């Protein structure tokens, strides 16, 4: 819901997520940028880090 709420239609996605009680695993580029973590690409992946 974090990646879809920042694209379009914030109210609808927030309402659907609240009703469904969804959970976000924070495993994408946009979410890692939003919360302030290293993106999982390039030099931010486990082998190189």
């Amino acid at each position: 819901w974090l990646s879809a709420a920042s694209f379009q239609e914030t109210t609808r996605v927030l309402t659907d997520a609240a009703i469904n009680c969804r959970s976000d695993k924070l495993n994408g580029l946009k979410e890692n940028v939003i919360i302030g973590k290293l993106i999982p690409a390039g030099t931010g992946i486990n082998r190189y880090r």
Partner: protein, 146 residues
């Protein structure tokens, strides 16, 4: 179409009794600041007025209920309180917007999250930074590629 909604309230461990409110939260004060207008007075905050309206309606409703008023007046006050709360959460969704000085619609709690000028696309996906500058570029033919 109906099962998509009726099954969400069953598969999880929640209850459908969250759509009806009995207490309203209040944002911390430093997130809705009130500052002086160039050594004069304070000119609106766009969020401290919808709260004032809700509090006024709630106080009047409480005083009228604890007095023995007829049903018509209490019903009118309850309708007005409902409209005020609805305008607090989302202004303009039903009926006409609540305006202020200059016929300018007030900005609600859900208007600070949506749009290209909201929190998501203007404070979380892009920011302003330190150690930066700007100037006009000109051509230098004596330089190298690096």
């Amino acid at each position: 179409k109906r099962l998509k909604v009726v099954a969400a309230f069953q598969q999880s461990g929640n209850s459908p009794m969250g759509m009806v409110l009995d207490a309203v939260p209040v944002i911390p004060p430093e997130l809705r600041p009130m500052v002086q207008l160039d050594g004069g007075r304070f000119a609106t905050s766009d969020l401290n007025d919808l709260y004032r309206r809700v509090i006024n309606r709630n106080n009047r409703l409480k005083r009228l209920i604890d007095l023995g008023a007829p049903e018509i007046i209490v019903n009118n006050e309850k309708r007005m309180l409902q409209e005020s709360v609805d305008a607090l959460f989302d202004n303009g969704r039903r009926g006409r917007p609540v305006t202020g000085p200059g016929n300018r619609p007030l900005k609600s709690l859900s208007d600070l999250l949506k749009g290209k000028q909201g929190r998501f696309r203007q404070n979380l996906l892009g920011k302003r930074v330190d150690y930066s500058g700007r100037s006009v570029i000109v051509v230098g033919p004596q330089l190298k590629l690096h």
